[PDB]
């Protein structure tokens, strides 16, 4: 099976292991089932990540620009700033969305597109 | 009756192909929703116990 | 084979007669309970 | 940067896109890298 | 031989002549439907445990609901939901009682209950009245001068003769779609009927579950091209 | 003379349904190919590539069946017999 | 005489619309292949993919149209006949 | 004059299974190189790409056995014969 | 001697117009998926690359539209009649 | 009478084969293309990747393996006699 | 003589020039493919690419042309009489 | 009367050799492209990719010797005649 | 006699000039449409790339005027008058 | 009676070379299409691509020549003749 390792560039958020995890990548949405080929990948500006592992509910995370590497054994996504669902404050996520600058919007929207918004 | 008996004969292939692969995965799936249905119509009850 | 005759209205009214049952009785109720 | 041939996949939708949005991400991290080691450094 | 046409039961009344099988037919299929629909009227429930009928018909309204909202959202076009899901139901049930084992020999090959969608006039039927439906809701949405203007437009002016044509087409392959994917079928389980039985067999369920699979794809892309077109002609 | 034309009918018919069974069958492995890549790609595709993928067989079998339509008028009921 | 211009009109009109559906059929698997990639890679692309789409469809039809009309031409009407 | 409306239909049927073979065989191989690429790709997705590929299958098999059950129509049962 | 050379013309017509609207539809199926490919890609691009697209069109169509012209000679003028 | 049927039984069944070797061919072609790139990006999924080859191929080869009994039919058993 | 001979000039003048379209359709089809996916990744090129274009194009049509003079010579030039 | 055979069995074997010409040389063409895109992906990859493209080929080219065969018996070993 | 043998030269001819016309065009559509991708991508690999598609070009017109020959050979100097 | 077998015999070898020509022309530009995007992707693996571009070639070549061969035999051996 799959071990999914959402790794920031600060320190390592997640390393559980995963059935399949799904992202919108710069070439489309893309999802991973175990021994895909190796591939590495541009996620997106307001880039989530979606992941399905044995018994728990599915781990929505927002991703700020990361980067997706399809290993033989590992799928790693390397993250400047990740976050969880459970960390997400929904008003400042609808705040943020709507910001002038792109980057911080593109990242509100993550956040958003996590939160299920 | 011999194009009769054909294509009875024909149905009654179909019918076990359907009832033998077909029949349980539809009946399957339904029941799983049902099922889920069940959970959740649940839920909200216990919610409002809760 | 081609040339259409009255069964074009025949099927048609009946149609929509279907049309008018799952329209009121199906329809919205499945709505509904959705 | 000096391109050192140490000697002996797929890419989305292509490798010299994803280098070049990587290249700068790269020296970002060894910039972090050397922060991080020059706080260490200073305590 | 084969035959093509040869309808029974055919009639004539207020001077229009009227195929009898295929009325006969689109009745059976019609009166089924309904018996779907009051039993679920008479067994429809959000407080308990779904029936099955119940569960297909919340299955079929989803998915219809869900191509509607994807290109045509229901606050803009709520009546095609109603008419999606029946012209499946419609055309689903009408291809799949065709599968019962009805055929029988005369010596030339004969059925009982042989599919609507085989004779010209069903399919006509169907497709004409979504044409003018969705025509009419574009009238509606864009206004009776504003409807042809756009329709001749397109997407790109200056292939206005492309258009127009292509609105023409809508309908008359939407028929000839269904009729010719069941009148070809209505060929083919004929001409099985030309084999000893015992050779007969085997032919007629490999068609047979063809004609389930082919029967429902058309109903789904007649279905899902009354959305598309309902979605093109509301803007 | 009735020979000569519904032997004609016969041939034009054949042509017909060769034309309409090689855009079918061309057409439809395209339009599968498309949608087997895309749910390979992204499985949850599953969901929404069957609705641009109908419409896509609806386009490639109405030339076929269209053809076939036209194909019954020449061989039973050939237009210049 | 007639019995073979019909025949030949026949013939030539049954070439047309074998034709007119292999371009078609083709034409229009190629670009739905396109269309379904394209909402696979983008399921926010099934709203805008349309336009370029129809347009495709609609001029690889119009070669099937046309066709399908000078058909009309061979079969029912006759030049020569 | 049977025996031009046999030849003839023997033509027209050789047409249709060449149309119909040409079709099948290619929509075929197409639906089946996106089958191998994303197994090729996606090892776990097998399952999951079948109902995609015997889907499109499905399709152009049809096209072939329609065009199979009109060649027995003009071969066996040679209308305007 | 004139209803040979009237089928010979009717036959030939059909052959052009089949050729032609093969090479039409395919060639404006190909052209569009690039179309389509490119829109679904890049959205901002949609005017960018209709130039390129109804250039390469407008050559497609040419090639038909040629063909037209000439069936029209084969059917109506049919020179050596 | 059996001359002209023997010789459009004999072209009938020239098309067949003749369509059924481009299906049989193009299709093979196009399967085996998707396993050599498959087994190019991912040398061990060779295993993976003769499973659905055979079953695709096994499907084109079907297609011109039904024609090649049928153009017996036409060739050996010609209907029609 | 000159009926048949004219009449056998026609079909195969049909067959050139249909062939010739089909040719000549696919390509440039193909080819704008190619023009409008780089004129996409690259709105530059929209400048060189024009060059490996109309060369392309220029191959293509050259094959359709030469055709187009074939066709003539043998439609309103008969090689036999 | 077996001029008019021996003519039908000499059609249909060109028609046989036409066919099995155009799979033989798209279908190799195309394993060719996959082995030569391969082979460039990863150049020490050439001696692994030769198995499945002889795979392909030999699938290729038994469709085409088998139709070669058939065309010998068409021709040489007319049936019927 | 040799009225049909013009004929079925001339017939023969334009089967040749229509199939030396689709391989030319199609191949060299293909050719060019590497060559402009590959022009697209690299705008430096011009130079690089003339000489593989000169190449295949050469090769493709190759067939493409070995086909024109031997039509002169059906045409003109027709065997077996 | 040779009249007739020799017109057959013109119109089965035009089919022979005409199929030919399709086969290797679109083979020969889908093979050079693998070689030219290699040869961009990778400009220093010419002659590793090269060996698998001249075999893919003499593939479908041979499938051309072996059919001009089979032509000859059509149009000067004449096998029914
Ligand atoms: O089915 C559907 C079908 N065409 C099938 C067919 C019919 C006859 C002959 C060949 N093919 C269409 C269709 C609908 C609209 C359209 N455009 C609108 C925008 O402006 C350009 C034109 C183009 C196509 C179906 O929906």
Same mark, same amino acid.
């Given at each position: 099976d799959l071990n999914v390792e959402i790794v920031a560039v600060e320190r390592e958020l997640w390393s559980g292991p995963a059935t399949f995890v799904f992202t919108r990548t710069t070439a489309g949405e893309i999802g991973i089932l175990p021994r895909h080929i190796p591939l590495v990948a541009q996620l997106v500006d307001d880039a989530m990540v979606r992941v399905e592992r044995e018994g728990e509910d599915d781990l929505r995370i927002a991703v700020d620009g990361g980067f997706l590497s399809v290993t033989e054994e590992t799928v790693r996504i390397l993250v400047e700033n990740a976050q969880f669902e459970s960390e997400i404050d929904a008003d400042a996520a609808k705040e943020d969305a709507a910001s002038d600058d792109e980057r911080t919007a593109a990242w509100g929207r993550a956040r958003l597109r996590a939160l299920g918004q | 009756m011999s194009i009769f008996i054909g294509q009875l004969i024909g149905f009654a292939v179909i019918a076990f192909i359907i009832v033998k692969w077909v029949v349980p995965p539809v009946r399957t799936l339904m029941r799983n929703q049902q099922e889920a249905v069940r959970a959740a119509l649940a839920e909200s009850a216990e919610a409002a116990k809760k | 084979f081609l040339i259409p005759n009255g069964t074009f209205f025949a099927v048609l009214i009946i149609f929509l007669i279907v049309l008018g049952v799952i329209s009121k009785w199906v329809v919205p109720p499945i709505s509904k309970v959705l | 940067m000096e391109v050192e041939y140490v000697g002996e996949y797929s890419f989305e939708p292509d490798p010299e896109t994803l280098f070049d949005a990587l290249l700068p991400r790269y020296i970002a991290t060894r910039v972090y890298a050397a922060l991080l080691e020059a706080a260490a450094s200073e305590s | 031989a084969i035959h093509v046409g040869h309808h029974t039961l055919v009639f004539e009344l207020f001077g229009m002549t009227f195929n009898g099988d295929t009325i006969l037919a689109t009745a059976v299929t019609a009166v089924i439907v309904i018996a779907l629909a009051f039993y679920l009227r008479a067994?429809?429930?959000?407080?308990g445990v779904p029936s099955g009928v119940q569960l297909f018909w919340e299955a079929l309204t989803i998915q219809m609901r869900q191509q509607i909202e994807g290109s045509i959202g229901m606050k803009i076009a709520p009546f095609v939901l109603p008419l999606s899901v029946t012209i499946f139901v419609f055309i689903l049930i009408s291809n799949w =009682?065709?599968? =019962?084992? =009805?055929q029988y020999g005369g010596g030339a090959a004969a059925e009982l209950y042989k599919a609507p969608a085989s004779d010209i006039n069903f399919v006509l039927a169907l497709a004409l009245f979504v044409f003018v439906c969705y025509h009419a809701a574009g009238i509606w949405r864009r206004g009776i001068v504003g409807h042809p203007i756009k329709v001749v437009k397109g997407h790109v002016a200056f292939l206005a003769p492309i258009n127009i044509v292509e609105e023409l087409a809508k309908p008359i392959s939407l028929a000839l779609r269904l009729f010719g994917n069941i009148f070809a079928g209505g060929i083919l389980v004929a001409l099985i009927?030309?084999?000893?039985?015992?050779?007969?067999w085997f032919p007629n369920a490999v068609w047979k579950t063809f004609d389930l699979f082919v029967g429902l794809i058309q109903a789904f892309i007649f279905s899902l091209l009354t959305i598309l077109y309902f979605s093109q002609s509301m803007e | 003379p009735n020979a000569i034309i519904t032997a004609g009918a016969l041939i034009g018919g054949g042509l017909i349904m060769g034309g309409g069974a090689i855009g079918a069958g061309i057409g439809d492995g395209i339009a599968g190919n498309a949608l087997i890549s895309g749910i390979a790609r992204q499985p949850e595709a599953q969901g929404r590539l069957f609705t641009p993928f109908f419409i896509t067989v609806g386009l490639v079998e109405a030339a076929y069946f269209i053809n076939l339509a036209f194909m019954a008028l020449f061989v039973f009921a050939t237009p210049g017999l």
């Open positions: - | - | - | - | 067994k429809v429930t959000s407080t =009682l065709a599968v =019962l084992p =009805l009927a030309m084999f000893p039985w015992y050779i007969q | -």
